[PDB]
Structures are given as structure tokens and as C-alpha cells.
């Protein structure tokens, strides 16, 4: 029963090889794996249009059947290494593979792969949630026997089993130096938030990562990896086994139709001065009032850009704004306008998610006692927005958390022996209403709520929103609100209301989303003339302070950079605009002086 | 063919994709004063 | 592939005909010479060069490494054979154990052909310790570099231990004797747990069938020292974006006791897995210790240290981006080089921060961590703890000559209050989590940085009226800087200028002096190290004349401005410190002038 | 578990391998592989104790130790022959290794082979008996699937078994020309029939030949074999496997003692014309009369000398006696002194061994159905005696057969598609009483018996005894059986027997055993005198036979010859002396002229 | 540890010869119209 020969797997690895061997033709792997041998590692990366321009009939053996051809992909591999030196083959026992380019059917989502891939190459995009740590799996076990000074090995694989007599019940030792272990990590991928329904339900799936590609990727990361669908040992379970893992750009780009890139386009130059004022209007326009309030909103969908020196610094481009007002107030109908408008937010509540919290967290699984990674809500909204209600309900753990991605946009854990430091750089709408309602202008913004002080100074903007009873005013609001009351759709007969189903001038919220993604992917840079014009005002500003909100300090100068580098992306200006500090500057002052 | 015991070899083994769902009788449908019967 | 009775052999040829000449060229048997002490009991643990393994042998040596395990056993068991040679004299029974192994001797030799159970473990034939010493080509490997490719090998490494466990005794042998025939049975033990036995195996049991239940004996069984720390990853070893990783170490016998938390030691031994099922085993691993050690340019660069403004332009390298502050800058730098402490004195300066919030605090703590060759940054544990059972040292023990870096001061614990205060007093801190005033050495300089509470500073309100900190911490600080929001237009405007410039290039504005890499910034106070000026005595003369005229100041001051001894002292501190940036081994009047005028302006800071 | 390496194994193939290369010493052994190689065969011959005297340990655990270190000594030595040779060795599959050399203890025979040497190499000596068809085994099958394109292999060696279907059950063609198959007998040997005592039970032990060892060897054959003894998978079946097998020499030699040389030596030169007599007088010393027949039988049991000539003429040096004469004459009682006497015979009655009979016979085995060329007594006879009882009475069968053994010596034999061809050299001694009792001294004897007139001829002697009523014969007669019956032993006082026993001048008959034993390795030659006295006697005969038992003729003539020859090795005279030729003559002449 | 079903090992298989008898009683020590036993 000792299998001979395979043909198949002969000539299959054959054309792995005349594939590999890139002399005659532009040297372009030859080079790779030159350069892979330079590297000194040991996982050559595979673009699979070339294996179907070379043999399309093979590319098609490979993604039907990724298993047995990796398995002959990789022996050709190391038979190539050792052509091209022998010894750099020796130092490693294998080499692998890693896939990449194109794949129409078999490049899929969490939420798309079906279990009709299995035993199939997949190029599954998505968002890590959960990490495991590092551990060293075993996967090949040499063992001695003094007794019959006979030594014995036995291969893992895929395949209590640890031998440790001889069949004549010899102690058996095991020799740890030509034992094979391996670094062995497992993590968690899930659709992207923003494109995902509310209706359905999650799409975890597990990959598993070894060897070099055991620590590239953390939670919260927006990676695609090819891999090679399975089963598991039992009704089964299912998970991929990474053959090669990249972290896409989080910005991504705003592809979608050239249309609206034109209508964009057209827009923009329409009324480009005015086109911050009139997103504003219609930003939030089923609530009168609070048109700043709506300006900065605008400012933080667009934020800033960040800057870094060669000192490694990562000075923040994002923005915080902080909301505070008397319950029965559109505070919380702002918040559902913005999870509604942004490209990219998620929201969560004064509690935070359950059990990570705000920021990350450790979790043992409970299923098999085993540290998991989770990362939390505020992780997951790196290079995007976070709006968070009930604010002043905040955790004390929470309250502290947050300082750091407040000041550093990254969160650190060492705890449960657990060592991480993960990404949250993530512009912040926050909001809490006064304790005991009833805003006092008197006591500090702190004092009403109770922040410390500390997140005060890190948030970039602070509004105060009060229940006046202006006649006046509360008419025009109240005016406003019976209008939306009573209007009614075009095509409707005052008679029935909306059904009951199952699914869940001014502009739309679809292109305004697109075009502040156009807008964020702009980039917007310092005018001499703005930045002189800014400085002066910071003076002014300071000059302001001698009256007797926080006082003006290089926090609010920066507030006010970003400021108008987001309202440079509002213009789609390639620069910033004396209009943009202009309109930063007054925003500002309404902010600190009424 | 060690008689019962057999090894599984998922590798060949073809699944599909699996959900269980409870579904109840219709507020309307159940008698007054009944428990609706889950299916 | 290879006879370990082959390599048997070799080994025991080298060791028995290995020599080097001693002092005064004495030709000797280095280990021959260890063997006649082992045989004597004169020695219990045999530390191995592997380099003298690479003199006559070095395909052995790698043979060694590339399973370590493997020949540690070889060489255990060729030293248990050749020690009858080298022995000449019969020692007194050093303890129970030796008697107790010659009397299991005896009754063995009373016994022809022996079955492998019936005849005494090579482990309990022992009372010595063999190890190994890392060779020098192999260098010393960083935590993060050691994966699973390296276990089952042994490996040089280098850190600072986080912890260590309490010594106790580690089971090597058990011992147990049957409950009828009265015969004696061992188990050596791998894991760190076990079963103990039952049913005696001995063959007169066996045959009898009597039921003979082992019953286990503590003076049988043979013991051995064992604690266990976690290593931790050097300063210099994790890059900026990193954080360090711990190692799990398992030191035992002789081993033991020779190292303490904050200690920047160097260890080798073999790294191996520990199981304390998918697709393969997974299993922890951690690095058993052999061998513990506790550790400690070109002509234009001495052309530059020559330069007058050398240490003015390193000053306007620390943080060049922010903007002004230059003389605090100048302070930062005299805290990162230190004092001398000749002899004590206390050469560490600790610097004390307060001011409004949004002035480049926090900021210049980081850049100083950065900058700092052995550093730590905490906020307010900081000081160690008794973790349930092991000292975990806080990051004040693991600054160890570092620099602890403190923001947010202001709102440390009081009790942690009372902990920096023994460490300015004794360089030591107490703690007590039983009753057990346990005392760690915490040499380190302490960089403090608070705000006063309720806004910015007051100047109407007097110093500890905006902060809430007791004033004699305060005067412990060797400095206390304190800055001031005043409102500048021009200087405002100068710094909002050099912000922009930031933004619109992502550095600071050309400076007079180009910022300096942060590695050549190190390489100098490395240098300054190296240096330890004294105080020749006819500066004392200028010395106390400055001191007694800044005390009068002080009288004639309506608030009291701190003036003691305390400052005298630091004032020494510093002026050495600045004769350590001059390269030059004696103070000079200009350094302690610049000193006082330091010192002067912390004080015209509180202004 | 998959073995890597075996250190004991390595050191043993090693040390086989420095063994066998034998140039810096005398070369015996590398001239052996080099005539091994130029004579094409695959199993060298190896001398046991040069083993022990260049490795008594080795040596040692070769003996104690069969499979293992065999299989390791044949790697070495397939090596050796690659180092040699390496085309040469490719040849070949495998190779072979032949032990000899003294065995201790582990020489035994079948009736000392105990269970106790189970998997240590033995050297058994004695006879075969059984011997199957040479049939072809297979050993490493080779199979080849068209639907995977893939070859395997599947060994047995030791080892619905014979695979035909892939896992996937698709067809498995056997590749025939890759398959490895080698020829394969099966045997059993017996104790020495001589040397074998009559209270044990047979002890009958296979063995099993392969390669060129399968046709070294027939029925009736005195072999040597060396081989390692091994239990059979099931109270188990037990074979031994040859590893060579060697032909001793049927004439082997007269060990016994010096002492029993020199008192033959001294007893052949006490008095060597009376030595014949001497022997005769003492030959039968209970039977009274037949001076003649007890002359001839010793000549028979002396025996001729055999002359192979140049034409392959096989002149046979054996000399074969019928009795005929009335019952209750001494004939059954002459055999028996035969039995006790010769040296080696083996007894027989007319019907001959059950089944096989007196020749050989094919016999299907009934526990498989499996055929057996069962050797019969007249080959198991062969260069010794049959003394065949009631031959009146054999069957025609066996009447046709032994003509062929009495012209030739040799039985043949095709049926079933058996062919072989048996030695079957045996002076043999048959008996028969006259049908109806009373002889008619008028016709011939076969007239009287009725031998065909073939057989006669065929007979160098036929002697006739008659119970002729002559008183004084009778009484001489009785007197000589009376005497014997009153007989006691010396020490007895005339009471009691001989004890129920549980078990079974004049010359002793182990004496006179031993004498003929050590005079039938004399190889007496003509001297012209007695060749031209001899010549002149026969054609005096021929003469005398003008009156007219069978005329004299050229077999009257080799039959003297015979007799000359058997006289002179009665005298130990290698010289053949006209003393022998002459009582040959009057011999004769008492044979046809009463 | 296959179940029931396991494979032996003829090579370490040690063994020792083996054989059976029968034993009459005696003539003599049988009863009178008796059939001896047999063991
Ligand atoms: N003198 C200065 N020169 C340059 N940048 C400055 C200066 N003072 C403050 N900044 C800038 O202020 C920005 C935000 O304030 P910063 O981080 O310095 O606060 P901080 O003083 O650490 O405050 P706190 O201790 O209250 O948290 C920083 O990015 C820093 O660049
Ligand atoms: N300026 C406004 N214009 C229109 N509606 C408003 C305005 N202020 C408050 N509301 C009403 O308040 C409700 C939402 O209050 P909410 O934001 O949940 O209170 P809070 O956020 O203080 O808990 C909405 O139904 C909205 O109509
Ligand atoms: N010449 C003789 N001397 C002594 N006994 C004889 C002689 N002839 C016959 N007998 C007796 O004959 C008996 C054996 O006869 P047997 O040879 O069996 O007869 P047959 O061979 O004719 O069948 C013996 O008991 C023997 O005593
Ligand atoms: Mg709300
Ligand atoms: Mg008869
Ligand atoms: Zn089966
Ligand atoms: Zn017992
Ligand atoms: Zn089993």
C-alpha cells in the first residue's frame, strides 16, 4: 500500500517549476525569489493572472483543487531554491506560497462565502475583529529510544497521540532540537460595517496563520487574505488556512460610478464658496437652529490631515466635538443624521459595547478556556467616527481609556500577559446631557456633567445648547417641527400611514456621503497667506483671553487647522483659503463666546 | 468493513451552509387565552 | 544520524585531556581540575564553555546547539562516569544524600544480568549541576527574534527581569517504598506536576501480589533549588512602534538567587516547550536558564564636542519642534546625563514640571523616553507588588538609572506620593503587601510633570495654592520649573508661526543648529558616563560665596524660596553634570555659574 | 511514526560491510563477490566461524539473532556489490547471503530440533523425503490506475488481501513486468534413517526454498541446510527457512573410534584368507546350512564399485540376491540378520510403504490438495540396501518400476505434470517363497514364482533352498536348533525370562557392523592376473554351459566381477587377489550347478 | 486498546514443544467387566 508514482503530481509540479523557472522569459519570479533569498525568508508571493497567462488550464487546477497543487507548488518551490543555491534550501525544512491578483468568483466577503467553497482558493476581504496569541504548534515530533538506540519520528499535519513508548514499551525521549514547531496564530474576520444590512445577521470566519504570517495583522484591520477553505474534524465546523495576508488601505476610494464623480464635479464648481453653507443647511435639515453646530459636524465628517515629523510623531488630523444640552433636545436626532450621512461610523451607547467596551478588551473564549483579543468599538472605528450617547454614563475604566486614543489615536494592552497596541485613530462625536438637566452657566462645563477637565482640553470643540424659552425662538422651532408634521409624501392620499415592514434645494444624504468620501480623499495643504492669516487671529485670540468655556492655548490653534483643512476638503480645494481659517475662526468664537 | 468505529476525511466531504429557526403562530392566529405553538 | 555513544566519547575526551594555561601560564585541566573538585564535593555546579568546545571541535559545538538537550545529558552522564576516576579522596557524607546514595550503592553492589527498572536513575546519582555557556560567536538574540523555529536549541538572550518567584524546592526524584516487600522505588519528574505512585513494581511485590501501596519519602526523593521570572524586553530592543515582551524563565540549583527585578541581565539556556489540539499541539514555551549574568568615535565628533555651543546645540535638539523653553530644554539635557555620585552623593536629578495644560509637557516627556537610552512613562503599578506569589516590580524599579517619566503628577495616590519621597531620599522603595517591608534598589532620576487644578496658574495665588501636592515634595524635586500662560501677542504669534511651518512642512523651522539623530545624542551621554568630574576644593570657596548670597536672597524673599542644603547639594549635581557635557574630569566656575543661573531661573519661573 | 535511524542496525551493516571487504586481508571473500559477479548468481556463501574469529560478538548475534542481522549482512553486501559493480548489482532486486562453518549447538537434527532455537539460525542434517512443486510466489505487486494516473506498490514479504480497486474504487491493473516475483518449494527433511531410533516418533521438519535454492535439491537426497527457524502465525505451525542448502555425500564416512580402526586393522591383518569365511560362519550363526547364501550375502553387503564412464555408462557396482525356497526355511530369519547387520537398509514387505509404496509416488496432501513427490523405500535406499519380504507378492505396478531401478538405479517419474528423476542406486536382497509352497525342482523359478524371465536376468544371484527330507540333514538341523533354544545367559539359574521389556570366534554383530561399514569406503582396482584368470572362468562357463537354471552370460560376467570386487574389500586388499575371483567362481558355480 | 481484534507477532512469539497422550488404566486395576477409563 506504499503509493510509487503520481503522473499528475509529477507533471503538475513539473510546470510549476518550468513556471518558476524565469530565465527565458522577463526574470520576473527568478528576481523574487532572488530577492526572496536575499530576504532570507521563506514564502514566495504568486500573482495568479501570470500562472493563467502562463497555463490557464493550471490556474484552474490550482483554485478548484488548492490543496494537493500548493503541496506540489511548494515542492517545486523548494526544488527551484535548491537549484539556485543549495545550503539557503537547507536551512528550512519547506517554502510556501502566497497567492495574489484576481479572482472573479473565488474573491468573496465574510457575508458571501458560501460553504460551496470549500477545498477552494478564496480571496476573502474583510475586517479582523478577534486575535489569538502566538503559540507554538508542533507539527513534527523526533523522538529517541536508548533502549533499542533507535530513533523514531512521526508527522502531525493535519492528522493524547503524543508517543512517548516503544511498541516494547521503551521511555522514549524526545529530541527537542530536530522536533519541528511552528508559531501558530488564529484570528476572526467579519463584513466592513458600512456595507453590511441591519437585517442579517454576522459572518464570522476563522483564519488561521502560521510561520511569517503568524503577527501580520492585528484587530481592527481592514485586510484581505487567500487561503485555502476547509472543514474541520467532526454537521462540521469550517475555517481558512492563510496561504498570504495584506493589509489594504483603510481609506480605500470612493469608486462607485463616474456620474457621480461628475455630478461632484459639477456641483463643486456650481457654487464652490457656498457649498460648505449649503451642506450645512441641508445636513440636518428636519432641525432648525444650531446652524454652527451643524457646520462643525460637517468639519468633523471631513476632519483634517495628518501631519507626521521625522521625530515619528502622528499629529492628528481628526477632530472632537463634544455636544451638551437639556434633555427633549435634537442632540440624539443629530447623532442618527450622522451614523446616517457619514461614510464610515458606527455608534454605541454611554456603556460602550458588551464586554470590549469602548476600546479593546481580553476575553477568554469559555468555549475551550482560551485568551481571545477582541477589539471594541472605538477600535473599529480607526479612520472614521464614533458617535457616543449618553456620554456622561461613561465608565470610569472608559473615562480613562480614553485619554490615550484621545491624545495618541492608539490603544495599548499589556494585561493577561497579553501585549498589544492597536490602532483607533477615530474622530469623536460626543454627547451627554447636564446631570439633573437644568444647564447652569455658571459652573464649569465639568462641573454640570463631571470630565475632569482633561477630556475637555482633548476635545477639539465643545457646543452648549440650552431649552431658552424665547417665544421667538421656541415659535420658529416649534413652526418648523408642525411643518414636518404635516407634510406629507407627493404621492399619498392623507389616508393610510407607512406599512408596517419587516426592512428598516437640499441635497441627499447617498451624495453627500459620496461626495464628503471625494472630499476626505482630498488632501488639502497650508497657504502662506491663510497661514498668516490664522496666526494673527490665534494672537487676537489670545489677545481675547485677557476677558474673563477653556481659554485659548495651541490645542485651539491646531482645532482651528483642522478646521479649516476640513473646510478646504468642503471646497475641494487643493489648498486651504483665507475663507476656510475665516470660517474656522468665527466658528470657533461662537463656540467660546455666545 | 475494527468493526463500527470509521475515520471521517473531511477533505471530500461536501457540506452546505445550515440554519435552524423557530417560527410561532401569528398574534391573530393563536385562540384567546392560548399559548402560540413553535415549530 | 550520529552514535551518542560516539559523542560520548569526545566528550569525555575533552574533558579529561582539555586544558588551558591558568595564571602565570599553568598549564591545567580546567574542567579535569572542576572533575577532581566535583569528586570531592567541592563543587556542585560545572558551568561549561562551549568555546572551549569550538577550540578543538566547533561541528560539535553547533551538534550542541542545534539540540541542546541532547548533550546536556551526554555531558551530565560522562562526568557521572569519569568522577570515580578523579577521585582520590573519600569526603565526609555532606548531608543525608551522600550517605543515603553510597548506602543505595552499597546494597546494588550487594546484587548478573538486571532488568532496566530495577537499577537507580543516572538523575539521583547526581549532587552535580552541569551548564552551559553560550558561545561568543553566537550573538545575543533578541526576545522578539526568538520564535519556534529556535526552541530545542539553546540561545543567548538579554532584558530586564520583570519578577522572580521566591526560591523553592523543585522535585528531581521521587522516592517512595513498598508497603510489604519493603523495596525502594523511583520516578524522576519532567512536568512541573505529576501523579505520585501507588502499587510498588518491585519484583518481589510484583511476584508476592501482597498489595504493596508505594508510600512516598521526602529523604528518599531528592530536591533541587528552582524560582521563576519573566525576562523582559530592553529599552533598546523594542522600536518606537513596539512594546516589550516578556519571557518566562525557569532558573534552578545553583542558579538560583543571583538575580532581582530591574536587573539588565543577559541569559542563556535552552528555550523549550512547556504543556502546562488543533491541527498539532499547541503548548507555552519558555527558556530553561544555564547561564545568568547582570550586565552594567570619529575626530569631527570630538571637533563638535569642542564646539563652546556643543551642549547648546544638543539643548536645542531636544525637542526642537517645540518652540521655545530652550533653557528648560538645556535642564532636560542635565537630567539625562546626571550627576556623578562620588564618593555617596546622589548623582540623580530629579526635575519637577507644573504648569497650564497645552505647553509641550506631555510632549517633552515622550521625546525625553525616546531620547532616553533606559526609560519608562507612566501616568498615576509605579511601584512593585506582591502578585498572588511573586515580586512584580512597578516602573519605578524598572527605570533602575533610567528615567521614570511622570505626567499627569498632580493626580498621582498619596501613597505613591509617599513612595517617590523614599526614592528621592534612598534611591530605594519599600513595600508591604503582607507586613513585609521588602526594599527594592530604584535608582532612578524622576521627571515630574503636573498642572495646577482649576484652570491655568494663578499667579495672585501663591505656589501650592493652584497645586495640591506637599510643598516639601517639592522641595525635594533637584529642579521646579513652572510655566506660565501669559499672553504674548508677538511670542504667540512667533509660535503660532512655527506651528504652521509644521503643518506645511511636517518639521520645525530651520534653526540656527540643525537637531541631532537621538543616536548620537545617546553616544554622547554615553561618554558623559564615562566621565566623573570631581569638585576641586578652591571652587568650594565660590561655591559657598554664591550659596550664602542666594540664601540671603531668600531671608530677604517674604516667601520662603526653598533655599537649604537641599540646593546647595543639587547645585553640585548640576555643575558636575555640566562638567561631565564638557568632557573635562573638573568643575569649572562656569559651570557652576550657569548652574545658579538655572537655578535662579526655576526660582524667577515661580514668579 | 515513521523510523529514521537505527544506530545498532547502522553499526551491524557496517561491520558486515567491513567484513565482507576483505582486500587488505587474504581476499578470500572479495574473490568470492568477484566470481559471484562473473558466475551471475545473487547469494554468497559464507563461512560462519571466519565471522566469529574476525567478530565473535557479531558472529554471536547472527546465531542468536537470524532476521534482522541477515537482512542487514544482505545489505551490506548489496552494497559491497555496487561498490564492485554497480550495474551488476542493479541487475538484481536483492541478494543473498550463504552461512556454513561448524554450528556449535545450533547443528542438530530433526529429531533434536526443539522449539527452543525458534528464531536462531540452524544447521539441520538428514534426508528428504517430501518435496512439493517448484511454484512462483509474489512478493512486491505492482498496480497502475488509468482514472488517477498513478502507480503503487504493495509489498508482503512476511506478510481480498490482493489489491484491485483504488480507494476511490477505481480499476487497479497489475503491471506484471514491475511486480517482483520469485520462485518458491516447499520440503521436508527427516532424521538419517540409520541413526534414528525405533521408540521415537518421527520428527518431520518443512522447510522453504526460494530463488535459485528451490530446485537445489530432490527426494532422497542426504542434505545439509542451513536456515533460520520461525513459527507461523496460528499451537503453531513451525518451518525453517534455507538460507543454502548443500548435498553431503551419501557415502559420508566411518567415524567411529580409533580403537575400532585398530582393532579392525588388526583383526584385517590377523588373517585375511580366512577373514571371509571367519565373517561368514559368524554372519548368520543361528541359521544353520547355506554356506553359499551366507558368502553371498556378505558380498552384497560389501558391495562392487560403481564405474561412471566417459559415455555417462553407468556400470553399477551393486550386486542384487533373490531367495527363493520352501517356507519355514531361515529366509525371513536371513533378513533380519541383514537388518541388524548392515550398515544401512531399510526393510520392506511385497505391498512396500503405505501409498508410495516401494518406489516414489505423487501424493495430493488432502490439508491444502496440494501435490507431493513423496519419496519411497527403494530411493530412500539408495548406496544402501532393501530387503524386501513376500517380493512374490508386490504389485505390477511396482513389478514394472523396478526395472527400471534394478537396470538404472534411478526412478523416473512425469505424472501430473511432475517431472523428475529420482537417484535410486540400491543393491537390494529380495525374498519370496514358491507359490503353493513345494517347489517342483523340474521347471524354472519363475515357473514356480513368476518373475517374467526379465527380473532374473536382472538378478547377478538367485539361490535356490529346498527342504529336502534327508534325516541326517534334519538332524543336523535340529541338533543346531535345540541347542540354541536351550541356551541361558551366563549369569541366569535357569528360572526366570527376560523382563517384559518397555523397549525394543564368533564375531559381535556391531563388530562385524562396524567392519563392513569401514570396508565398504575401500575402492579396490583389477590386476591384470585375476582380469585374464577371470576371463578364462567365464569362458569355462560358457563352456560348461553347453549342458542345460538361466545360461550363463555377459551379466554372469560383470556379476563376477562384482564379487571379485566385494572380496577384496573384505580383505581391505585394494589389489583385486585370484583368491577373490576364485571363490567368486566356485560361488557361481554353486549358484547354477548345485 | 480495532476493538477485540488484534494481530500477533510470531517473531517474539516465543514457544515450547508440545504434545498430548492418553492413558488407560490398567489391565489389572480396571473392575471386572469393566471398561478402563481414559485421561
Ligand atoms: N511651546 C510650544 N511649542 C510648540 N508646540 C507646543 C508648545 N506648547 C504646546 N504645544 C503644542 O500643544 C499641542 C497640544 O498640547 P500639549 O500636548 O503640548 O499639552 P500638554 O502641555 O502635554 O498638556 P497637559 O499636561 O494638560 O495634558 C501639542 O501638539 C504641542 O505640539
Ligand atoms: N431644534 C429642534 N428641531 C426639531 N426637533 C427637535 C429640536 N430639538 C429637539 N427636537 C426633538 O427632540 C427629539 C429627540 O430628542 P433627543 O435628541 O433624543 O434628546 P436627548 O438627545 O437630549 O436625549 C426629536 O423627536 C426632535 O423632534
Ligand atoms: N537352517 C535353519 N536353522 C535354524 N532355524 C531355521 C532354519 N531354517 C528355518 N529355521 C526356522 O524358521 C523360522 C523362521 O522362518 P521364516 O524365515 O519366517 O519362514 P519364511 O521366510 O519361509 O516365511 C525360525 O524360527 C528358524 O528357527
Ligand atoms: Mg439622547
Ligand atoms: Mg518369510
Ligand atoms: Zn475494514
Ligand atoms: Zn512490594
Ligand atoms: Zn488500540
Known sequence: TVVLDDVELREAQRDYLDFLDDEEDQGIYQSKVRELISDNQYRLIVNVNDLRRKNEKRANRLLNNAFEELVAFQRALKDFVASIDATYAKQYEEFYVGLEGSFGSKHVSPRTLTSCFLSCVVCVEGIVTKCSLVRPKVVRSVHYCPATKKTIERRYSDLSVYPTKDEENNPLETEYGLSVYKDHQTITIQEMPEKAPAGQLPRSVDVILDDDLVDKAKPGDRVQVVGTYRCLPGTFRTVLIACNVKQMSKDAQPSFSAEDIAKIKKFSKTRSKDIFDQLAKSLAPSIHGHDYVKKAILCLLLGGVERDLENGSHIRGDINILLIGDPSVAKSQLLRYVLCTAPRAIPTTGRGSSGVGLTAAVTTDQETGERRLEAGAMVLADRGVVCIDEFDKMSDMDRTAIHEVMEQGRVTIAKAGIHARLNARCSVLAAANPVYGRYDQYKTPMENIGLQDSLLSRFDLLFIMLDQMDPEQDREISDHVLRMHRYRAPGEQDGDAMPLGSAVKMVSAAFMKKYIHVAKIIKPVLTQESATYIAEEYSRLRSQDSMSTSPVTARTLETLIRLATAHAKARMSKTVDLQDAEEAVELVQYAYFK | ?39 | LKDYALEKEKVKKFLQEFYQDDELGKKQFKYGNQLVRLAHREQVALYVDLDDVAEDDPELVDSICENARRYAKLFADAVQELLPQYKEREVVNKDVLDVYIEHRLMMEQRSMVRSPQNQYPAELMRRFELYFQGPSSNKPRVIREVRADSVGKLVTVRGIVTRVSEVKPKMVVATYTCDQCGAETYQPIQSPTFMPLIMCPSQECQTNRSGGRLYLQTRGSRFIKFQEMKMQEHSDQVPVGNIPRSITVLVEGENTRIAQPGDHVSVTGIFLPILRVVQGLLSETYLEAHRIVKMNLTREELRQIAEEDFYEKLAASIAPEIYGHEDVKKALLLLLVGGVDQSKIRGNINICLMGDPGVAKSQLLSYIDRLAPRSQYTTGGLTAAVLRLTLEGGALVLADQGVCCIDEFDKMAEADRTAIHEVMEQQTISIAKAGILTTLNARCSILAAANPAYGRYNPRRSLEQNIQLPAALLSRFDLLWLIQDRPDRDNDLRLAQHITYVHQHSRQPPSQFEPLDMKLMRRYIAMCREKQPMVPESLADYITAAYVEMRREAWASKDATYTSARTLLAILRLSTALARLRMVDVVEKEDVNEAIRLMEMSKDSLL
Request: with cysteine; glycine share 2%; charged share 25%.
Open chain 2, 1 to 39: 468493513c475494527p468493526l463500527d468505529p470509521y475515520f471521517i476525511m473531511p477533505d471530500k466531504c461536501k457540506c452546505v451552509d445550515f440554519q435552524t429557526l423557530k417560527l410561532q403562530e401569528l398574534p391573530d392566529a393563536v385562540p384567546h387565552g392560548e399559548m402560540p405553538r413553535h415549530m
